């Protein structure tokens, strides 16, 4: 067949398998790319925490956490703890427009993990709560 | 006037679904309604998870009830659908067939605005 960019809906039967596992079963890599930090947490299909890493947990301080090298370092630290539990294929769910939004995705690949999808779950309200006032800096 | 009751019932068996529709159609007649038809849109999966009466629903039955009733019967029937435990979500809207559609002749081209600034040599 051809190749579609839309994810295979669970209900309808498909033929796309990864290591004999359906798309639903693949573990999920929740990335929260903030402006001053980047936390990464890998979970299974049944929401079971397997690995957690962040720039702070890798020995970075203050303004070094909001860089692209600290997010990549955090991906290698989470892709090395989850590869010992039998994780190879993951579903990336990026949340945030921070510096370590794409650099953490590269770090997960530098740990032996293969990314099959890229999901964006950045919080966008349909007017809800009021942000802080604009600054003059 | 003529209204349309978009009713989303809880996924149940045939005996329980028919008892709910009858109980719901009798409430309209008691408020002065003249039911006209009862269409079934079928049971499908909801677009989003609906939480009603301490229950999280993922499926439901879609039924339309076209009827005639006085203006005062709409507000009294909306309070009857909020207490029914087998009615996930139910909204009353004016029937779309009582709104004639004006004939259209097509798209009218719009010419750029003219004489917006003085014809002077700036």
């Amino acid at each position: 067949t051809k190749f579609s960019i839309y994810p295979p809906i669970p209900g309808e039967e498909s033929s796309l398998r990864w290591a004999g596992k359906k798309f639903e079963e693949i573990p999920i890599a929740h990335i929260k790319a903030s402006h001053n930090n980047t936390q990464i947490q890998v979970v299974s299909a049944s929401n079971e925490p397997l690995a957690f890493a962040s720039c702070g947990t890798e020995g970075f301080r203050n303004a070094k956490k909001g860089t692209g090298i600290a997010a990549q370092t955090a991906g290698i630290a989470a892709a090395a703890r989850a590869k010992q539990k039998g994780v190879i294929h993951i579903r990336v769910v990026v949340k945030g427009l921070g510096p370590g939004r794409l650099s953490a995705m590269h770090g997960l690949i530098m740990g032996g993990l293969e990314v099959i999808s890229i999901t964006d779950n950045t919080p966008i309200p349909h007017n809800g709560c009021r942000p802080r006032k604009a600054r003059k800096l | 006037p003529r209204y349309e009751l978009a009713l989303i019932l809880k996924a149940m068996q045939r005996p329980e679904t028919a008892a709910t529709l009858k109980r719901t159609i009798e409430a309209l007649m008691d408020r002065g309604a003249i039911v006209r038809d009862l269409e079934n849109l079928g049971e499908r999966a909801l677009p989003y998870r609906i939480s009603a009466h301490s229950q999280q629903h993922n499926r439901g039955g879609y039924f339309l009830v076209d009827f005639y009733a006085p203006t005062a019967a709409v507000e009294s029937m909306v309070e009857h659908l909020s207490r029914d435990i087998d009615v996930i979500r139910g909204n009353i809207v004016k029937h779309p067939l009582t709104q004639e559609l004006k004939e259209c002749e097509g798209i009218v081209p719009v010419p750029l605005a003219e004489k917006l600034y003085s014809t002077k040599k700036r």
Binding site: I69 | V110, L112, L116, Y117, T119, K120, K121
Partner: protein, 117 residues
């Protein structure tokens, strides 16, 4: 379809409140803006990160990280050529859109007339 301008600006015939409040008159100019400078993309960063990670493990010895250095070296050579090729070629080469200097010679041959003569 360019947005409309009917009943947008504050005028005498328009009874309704203005929709637009332009600070510069909406009259086409006889020139375009100059293309801005691009920030640019840093090159040979992945080769530069695996070469400095080997030094830490090997205590900054250039005898055990030889393979990594070549990746960072060969890349620099290729990247340097691209910068020279890109700057000269873009101006001389005609691709896609024209440049302002040549595009303003075309707009000055067909100037916009917001006056009568």
């Amino acid at each position: 379809a360019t947005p409309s301008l009917r009943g947008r600006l504050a005028r005498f015939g328009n009874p309704r409140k203005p929709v637009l409040k332009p600070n510069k008159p909406l009259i086409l100019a006889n020139r375009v803006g100059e293309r801005r400078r691009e920030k640019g993309e840093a090159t040979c960063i992945t080769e530069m990160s695996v070469m400095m990670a080997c030094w830490k493990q090997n205590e900054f010895r250039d005898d055990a990280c030889r393979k990594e250095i070549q990746g960072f070296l060969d890349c620099a050579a290729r990247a340097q050529e691209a910068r020279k090729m890109r700057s000269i070629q873009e101006t001389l080469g005609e691709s896609g859109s024209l440049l302002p200097n040549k595009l303003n010679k075309l707009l000055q041959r067909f100037p916009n007339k917001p006056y009568l003569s």
